[PDB]
Amino acid sequence: MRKYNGYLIDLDGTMYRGTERIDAASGFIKELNRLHIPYLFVTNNSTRTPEQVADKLVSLDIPATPEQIFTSSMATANYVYDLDQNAMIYFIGEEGLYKALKEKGFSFADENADVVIVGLDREVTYEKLAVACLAVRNGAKLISTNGDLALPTERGFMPGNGAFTALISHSTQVKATFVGKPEPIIMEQALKVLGTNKNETIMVGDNYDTDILAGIRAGLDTLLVHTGVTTVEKLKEYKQQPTYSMKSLDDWKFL
Amino acid sequence: MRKYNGYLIDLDGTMYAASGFIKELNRLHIPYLFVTNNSTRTPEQVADKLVSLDIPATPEQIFTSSMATANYVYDLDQNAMIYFIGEEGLYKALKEKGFSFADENADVVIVGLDREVTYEKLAVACLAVRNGAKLISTNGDLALPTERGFMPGNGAFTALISHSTQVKATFVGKPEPIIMEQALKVLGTNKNETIMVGDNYDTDILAGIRAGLDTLLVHTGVTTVEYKQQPTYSMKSLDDWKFL
Structure with a gap:
């Protein structure tokens, strides 16, 4: 009876910049884990393997397995394979x-x-x-x-x-x-792996032009964190906006 | 009293009827300079290749994009x-x-x-x-x-x-007028009496047009018979040129 029963968590932007953001991310992800809500981390990075990224996240007290890391390179291989x-x-x-x-x-x-x-x-x-x-x-x-x-x-x-x-x-x-982001193909390919329905999945991130725009274009609801007055005003002038804008992951309720 | 007393000549598919045309330029005593967008070879190498094809050329008759670029940067x-x-x-x-x-x-x-x-x-x-x-x-x-x-x-x-x-x-390089203006100076003729000869509209002909030079397009290379501005002349072969 949750609105959102799958989460796509961006790894890029400035999501984990500084101790406060890392701690907020740790708390948020731990809560998804406690609630048994499936999630996947999504990145354009092509210089680190899923194993390396998961090992780094766990070192920062952010629960992740290599199977939860989904890169644009994986999306590209999978998209081609299915065609x-x-x-x-x-x-x-x-x-x-x-x-x-x-x-x-x-x-x-x-x-x-x-x-x-x-x-x-x-x-x-x-x-x-x-x-x-x-x-x-x-x-x-x-x-x-x-x-x-x-x-x-x-x-x-x-x-x-x-x-x-x-x-x-x-x-x-x-x-x-x-x-890769800001194109939607990476997000449809992430949804394949996550397994949840498009209308019950949310992408969470803190960069619009590269990252969250991919979710918007893919047809997913989106949560843009680390926003401020000026950024919210700016997005209101664009063609498309995130579904939700907030200051911090700490502000999100598990709707 | 020829209309054209100096020729700028492409090598990017125009020289390799070419031998006959160049020889006639020599027989008529008309100055010429080969202008190439080639950035990898020296003029000695380009001239030798021409000579090997029975086309009269000295290294001093080769003007490459590398030479033009070095001259341009020296001017800057x-x-x-x-x-x-x-x-x-x-x-x-x-x-x-x-x-x-x-x-x-x-x-x-x-x-x-x-x-x-x-x-x-x-x-x-x-x-x-x-x-x-x-x-x-x-x-x-x-x-x-x-x-x-x-x-x-x-x-x-x-x-x-x-x-x-x-x-x-x-x-x-071509189609920019930078290489052309330098070539025109090297050749030493007036722009009014100089013609650029080439095979590719997008490089040779446009370079001539933008440099204020009449142009001859010979259909032996890139551009076929089949743009907003035509070459001054277009022909199937250098054999058809009448040395205006």
């Missing part, structure tokens, strides 16, 4: 994306691939990018895990997944299908 | 510390022009084709641009026709950097 499990895959990416594809038992190919998946590869080369262009020109579907153009690091803003997709898309004149 | 700042992505042709053009090189702290980032480019080389470019470096690209060609098919060209890599940093590049 064609016999597609030959060429991908650009790192271990998280390779693991996600391994899990689906794909065959892999280079210039004659059926599907080209572009993820972040911090060891990409001209040849890796060329093979993607040649396979697209041979008719492969072009799929991108994420659309980020730059990535914040300790050195500064480094090239992101989206910048490599743009290279391939410009060179081949073929548009990519993007999976 | 003779003492610029340069980070570049590229191969032999671009490196040699920049070194001959007297530049020193740098990485993240560079004053100017130049993007030329590098068929062994890596993430790190791209990242250094983005970091320097975000530090305030001017972003310059040798040429905007998005693909590169090869035996394997259409490989990514320099414009595709420039787009990557421009998208990541949110900074628009200044492009030197």
Whole structure:
């Protein structure tokens, strides 16, 4: 008789920035656990495995198993698998994306691939990018895990997944299908794993333009936390708003 | 009293009737200069390839996007510390022009084709641009026709950097007038008596149009018989040119 019986919890934005937010997240998640409400954590990150992320969350007293971590790379592998499990895959990416594809038992190919998946590869080369262009020109579907153009690091803003997709898309004149937030495909793929009904599931996060917009577009109700007067006013001027805006996870009642 | 007393000539699918046309330019004593968006080869290498095809060319008759880019950057700042992505042709053009090189702290980032480019080389470019470096690209060609098919060209890599940093590049090569204005100076003829000859509307013809030069499109390369402004002349073969 709860309105919401499944929760999709964003891992990105500024959700866990600082001790107060970490503690609020710990409390919130522990309560979902006590109430036996199913949840999944959702992220665009492609530099950490589900095991690594779960291990980090548990270290922060936030209950999570690797099976509760759902990445855009997993979403992309799963989305492609359900459309064609016999597609030959060429991908650009790192271990998280390779693991996600391994899990689906794909065959892999280079210039004659059926599907080209572009993820972040911090060891990409001209040849890796060329093979993607040649396979697209041979008719492969072009799929991108994420659309980020730059990535914040300790050195500064480094090239992101989206910048490599743009290279391939410009060179081949073929548009990519993007999976990760703020696109909705990652959220439908998360709902598959969570198992709850769209109208009984809520996405919780604290970034609108990248993260919560994905839930809105996917048809899910959304809770945007860490809001303030100016941000609530700003969203009122946009086409779409979160279902609920609050200051803190501590304010949420389990409706 | 010829209408055209100087010729700018493409190599990106126009020279490789070409031998006959060039020879006639020599027999008629008419000055010419080959203008190429190639950023990887030296003029000696390009001239040798022409000579091997029985097309009269000296290295001094080759004007590449690397040469033009080095000249352009020298005009911006003779003492610029340069980070570049590229191969032999671009490196040699920049070194001959007297530049020193740098990485993240560079004053100017130049993007030329590098068929062994890596993430790190791209990242250094983005970091320097975000530090305030001017972003310059040798040429905007998005693909590169090869035996394997259409490989990514320099414009595709420039787009990557421009998208990541949110900074628009200044492009030197065709269809930009920068390479053309320099070529016109190297050739030493008046713009009113100079014609640009090429195969690709989107590079050669538009470069001529934007530079204020008459143009001859010969349908031996990219653009077929089948745009908002026509070339001054269009023909199937250089054999049809009447040396106006």
